[PDB]
Design a protein around this ligand. Sequence first.
Ligand SMILES: *[C@@H]1O[C@H](CO)[C@@H](O)[C@H](O)[C@H]1NC(C)=O
Ligand SMILES: CC(=O)Nc1ccc2nsnc2c1
Ligand SMILES: CC(=O)Nc1ccc2nsnc2c1
Length: 340
Amino acid sequence: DLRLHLLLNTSVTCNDGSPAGYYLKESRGSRRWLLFLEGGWYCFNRENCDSRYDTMRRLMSSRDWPRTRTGTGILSSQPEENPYWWNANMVFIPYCSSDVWSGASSKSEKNEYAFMGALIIQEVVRELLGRGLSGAKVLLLAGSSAGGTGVLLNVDRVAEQLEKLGYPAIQVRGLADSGWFLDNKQYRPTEAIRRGIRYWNGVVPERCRRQFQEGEEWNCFFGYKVYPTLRSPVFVVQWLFDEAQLTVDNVHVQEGLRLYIQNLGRELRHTLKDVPASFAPACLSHEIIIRSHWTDVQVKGTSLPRALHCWDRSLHPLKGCPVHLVDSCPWPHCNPSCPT
Ligand SMILES: *[C@@H]1O[C@H](CO)[C@@H](O)[C@H](O)[C@H]1NC(C)=O
Ligand SMILES: CC(=O)Nc1ccc2nsnc2c1
Ligand SMILES: CC(=O)Nc1ccc2nsnc2c1
């Protein structure tokens, strides 16, 4: 089990001003550290954040968090369940800022809620350095859904933070699961992110900000636009027919919809052509890395735990150990190993 620690700096808060925190299981025989960012949509104005506070309060507050959580999937410590990193130090960072991990704004006389996702990540890293992260060789910042987008927005800031604090030997890497979205034409929008950034005081990576400039930082929330600007190594996991993508596209089969779905898969495939570390199966699903049966899906005969191990070796092409795995077949479940 992973044990809850609320942040000692109580000014780094969830939406309602309660302290943020993290769940930790140490592995004293390991110099590898996995920090995982939870997902769960977002909110972007007073009215829809108020609604989220009524029926999704654990995503806005630490007041009701449990003292422990069980690690699953890539967060499991059993080799049978996690062939990749079962002996690592494990950290689960709850998502309680509703800002895709981008915010840097405190609650105040003018702000009903605090949006501090970017600061929560920095403070967790700071406090872990006294609990053994100072001796790490690799820090893998991972996340699913909104947490996968959060990896893309924050991995280079973690790398800069550790450099400026005096830890140049820690290698920072990212693993973004189900957070690679397309700003495509709907079957039947980006305004939500633009409004959110202003409501959250949201921050994006500096090189991407300099490309798109003021008023256009929403572009940096889209993987295919922010990824080329990043310096840390990043592995991208993305279903070709992601259910959250299709929901925003207003898709729930005749010729028009057939062509729409086939075009979505082809566009997703295209955006990953120049991403050398990636895993993109032709399935209709959403998230993968913390579910218990994450080992089952394969692309071209290679599972995701194997592909991640091959990535580790590459950062020391490899014979029989591939790291770029993108399906080419054009319809959901044309890969027999898709989850049911
Ligand atoms: C707590 O975090 C805030 C926001 O990052 C920072 O301004 C403040 O200095 C921190 N407190 C301490 C004691 O470091
Ligand atoms: C349901 C939903 O809309 N999820 C998300 C989360 C983060 C995003 N960043 S860009 N588009 C995104 C969409
Ligand atoms: C024009 C536009 O904004 N299109 C879309 C479509 C699906 C999305 N999923 S997340 N952000 C999305 C944006």
